[PDB]
Design a protein around this ligand. Structure first.
Ligand SMILES: CC(=O)Nc1ccc(-c2csc(N)n2)cc1
Length: 189
């Protein structure tokens, strides 16, 4: 198959475990569940890794423990050990420009100021990796953005985000076999 590694973004520690900026982590903890994988700390990859058993080829799951703006250090290390190209990687992140429970998909392109995406583009040497974008909404002024992502959504949007990841979990066969148009048409409904 295609896409060899799936990455979830977040900050480490329990003081960040419930914040919006950890939405990627929330997806991965459930994607691991779908594939019966478990997490082990790999120091050499700077994070927690999991092997996902698939008939067409194993898929690696990674949550970096680098802090967000150093996320690329973990991604580049994993792709280094197992010889994985940028276009064979999917990264799951929070997306302000769409509201809670919306979900959108693209390959490469702009990052919308995300500090994790920034470092991953910096360390892989290109923007050309796949992104699963999870809506978390946005405040009124973007001078407020940093404080917004570092806080709990809670209640309604947490439920809408769980629905978001549930609906994202059904598109993964087409994502991994590589059917961009198919998964993109399923997700944008
Ligand atoms: C000092 C610090 O926390 N910087 C930072 C930079 C960018 C972002 C960001 C952009 S779009 C999104 N969802 N998050 C968050 C935080």
């Amino acid at each position: 198959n295609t896409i060899k590694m799936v990455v979830g973004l977040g900050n480490p520690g329990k003081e960040y475990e419930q914040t919006r900026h950890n939405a990627g982590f929330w997806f991965l903890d459930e994607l691991a569940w779908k594939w019966k994988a478990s997490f082990k700390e790999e120091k050499k990859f700077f994070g927690e890794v999991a092997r996902a058993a698939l008939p067409d080829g194993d898929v690696w799951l990674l949550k970096p423990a680098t802090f967000m703006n150093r996320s690329g250090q973990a991604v580049a290390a994993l792709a280094q050990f197992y010889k994985i190209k940028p276009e064979e990687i999917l990264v799951v992140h929070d997306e302000l420009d769409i509201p809670c429970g919306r979900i959108k998909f693209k390959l490469g392109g702009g990052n919308g100021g995300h500090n994790g995406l920034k470092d991953i583009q910096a360390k892989l040497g290109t923007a050309d990796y796949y992104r699963l974008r999870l809506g978390i909404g946005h405040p009124g002024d973007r001078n407020l953005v940093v404080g917004y992502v570092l806080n709990k959504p809670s209640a309604e949007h947490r439920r809408q985000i769980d629905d978001a990841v549930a609906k994202s979990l059904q598109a993964v066969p087409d994502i991994i076999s590589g059917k961009w148009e198919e998964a993109t048409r399923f997700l944008h409904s």
